Amino acid sequence: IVEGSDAEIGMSPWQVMLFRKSPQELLCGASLISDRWVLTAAHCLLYPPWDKNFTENDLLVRIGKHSRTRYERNIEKISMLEKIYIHPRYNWRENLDRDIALMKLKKPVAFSDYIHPVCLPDRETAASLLQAGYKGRVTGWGNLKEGQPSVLQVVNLPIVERPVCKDSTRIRITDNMFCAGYKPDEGKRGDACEGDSGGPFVMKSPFNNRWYQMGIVSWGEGCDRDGKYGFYTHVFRLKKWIQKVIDQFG
């Protein structure tokens, strides 16, 4: 996170740490949607160009964290994956299209002041909040500068209009992606950065007061560069797949 600020304790109780067992190391961010399912970015588990292809064995999921490197004794729950589900049509080859994956926990996690699930949007919440100008929030243990924080960082950024999104890069944008960030003009800054991947882009509904995940940190070019924007997976658009797997597989 660039130009963000330390989170408060329990500000993002659905924020998960993807942790490599060997060497020990932060793979990405992720989120808790139920006591057995975690939402991440598929490129965090599979990315052949970089020779990244993780397996269940390969990983550890850490919930309730604040501190990037201490093991938070009595606060954080560490689990194991029972299985990984990549979106069958994720496009690792051209643009990170359909960058979403699910990971079923080996055993349910007990909720706590520091551990709680986020809500997935419904068609209408999605309709009312996914708007150019509206703010959402990104969180992660990612780079601070296009280095790492000691604690979870946060930044609120406005959703930006599709055209504007599209004219900022040479990468092909699809309907499964939305970009977010301020305009050079608006001159106020912040972006997600490397190591934020897979973390949540959330909004708070003004109707029922809940927090909903609207996006997954996906990609960018640089960090906090002017006239550039972060790109996130559009979660509502991929909800049928999400739905489908949580009903067939567990």
């Binding site: 067992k21 020990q24 932060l26 490197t69 093991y71």
Partner: peptide, 10 residues
């Protein structure tokens, strides 16, 4: 930089 974790997790 990562502090070590309890063995029951590996």
């Amino acid at each position: 930089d990562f502090e070590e974790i309890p063995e029951e997790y590996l």
